């Protein structure tokens, strides 16, 4: 099937994986015979959004919005906004409601691990708690105290980064081997060798307690890298490995946005609780009013970027590892009725 760009390309998935084809499709049409990333975004994207937000109250508001959109698709009329120039049909609304259903599922579970409800809530209701302040259950990971939790969280963020990167590189190497693109497999295996070398070297340079197998580990990694560069005769590979290093350490943004949003919400609710406590009996009304209004302004301000970071992480990084972009595929179109 190596007869050039001849074959039109169409995509199909299991029924749960169809809604994410909307997200992945509009970037580019892949070449025929190339692996498609369509099953990877269903499992990864709402997972990352869930660890990002973790706000139960905003998840409930998103569920209310989803109820509004499901009512819209039930009445089966198109939704039109002339101000923003969007006309969309009910089926796209259904695909979006599937997305937000999975979205609020992951948001809710990550929120119950991250028990903060509209920010700090344990001061008013002791269902959650700390070792300091008694409660029904302690917060499993208190994502306010950066003294101990921060290191663990950057560890999982960097772990997600590692997993995603060698998955993409292994896909690239697999395609290079299978399609007789043998040099592409060489580039991929050189990337894997260089990457394991630099990560082992960084782990030794940061927290080593003994040399052991590690010296042979990065020596083998760098040897694989320089051999793969050497016989391939292409010298562009050298700065591109620090480009990959940047792609590895680019994954801290999920923890960063989560900490920022949660601490902002906690400060807002702390202001509300302080207003309730200081003013006495009547302060709770003004405190709740101001808490709700600043909560709404901050949500319509911040929910766009929080949504953008994980899908961006899927877009720029993963699709460029295996080779999504460098050629366009011919789209599929049948000669059938317009109806």
């Amino acid at each position: 099937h190596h007869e050039a760009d001849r074959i039109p390309v169409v995509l199909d998935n299991p029924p749960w994986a169809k809604p994410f084809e909307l997200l992945v499709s509009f970037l580019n049409t892949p070449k025929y015979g190339t692996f498609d990333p369509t099953p990877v975004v269903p499992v990864f994207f709402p997972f990352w959004f869930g660890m990002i937000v973790g706000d139960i109250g905003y998840a409930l508001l998103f569920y209310l919005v989803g109820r509004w959109l499901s009512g819209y698709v039930k009445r089966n009329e198109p939704l039109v906004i002339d101000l923003f120039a969007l006309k969309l049909k009910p089926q796209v609304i259904g695909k979006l409601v599937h997305i937000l259903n999975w979205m609020v599922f992951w948001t809710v579970v990550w929120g119950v691990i991250y028990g903060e409800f509209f920010g700090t809530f344990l001061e008013h209701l002791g269902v959650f708690g700390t070792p300091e302040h008694p409660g029904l259950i302690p917060i499993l990971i208190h994502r306010i105290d950066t003294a101990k939790t921060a290191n663990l969280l950057i560890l999982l963020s960097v772990a997600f980064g590692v997993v995603l990167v060698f998955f993409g590189l292994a896909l690239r190497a697999y395609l290079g081997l299978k399609h007789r693109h043998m040099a592409h497999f060489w580039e991929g295996v050189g990337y894997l060798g260089g990457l394991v070398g630099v990560l082992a070297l960084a782990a030794s340079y940061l927290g080593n307690l003994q040399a052991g197998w590690l010296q042979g580990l990065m020596y083998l990694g760098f040897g694989v890298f320089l051999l793969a560069v050497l016989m391939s005769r292409i010298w562009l590979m050298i700065p591109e490995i620090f480009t990959q290093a940047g792609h590895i350490l680019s994954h801290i943004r999920i923890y960063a946005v989560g900490a920022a949003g949660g601490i902002l919400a906690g400060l807002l609710t702390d202001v509300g609780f302080a207003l309730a406590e200081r003013l006495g009996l009547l302060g709770v009304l003004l405190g709740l009013l101001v808490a709700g209004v600043l909560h709404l302004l901050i949500l319509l301000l911040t929910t766009l970027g929080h949504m953008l970071q994980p899908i961006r992480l899927l877009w720029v990084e993963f699709f460029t590892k295996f080779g999504f972009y460098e050629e366009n595929g011919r789209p599929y179109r049948p000669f059938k009725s317009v109806r």
Binding site: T146, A150, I252, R253, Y255, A256, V257, A259, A260, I263
Partner: peptide, 8 residues
């Protein structure tokens, strides 16, 4: 975002 990450 990384600036605030440095901050906390």
């Amino acid at each position: 975002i990384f600036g605030l990450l440095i901050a906390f």
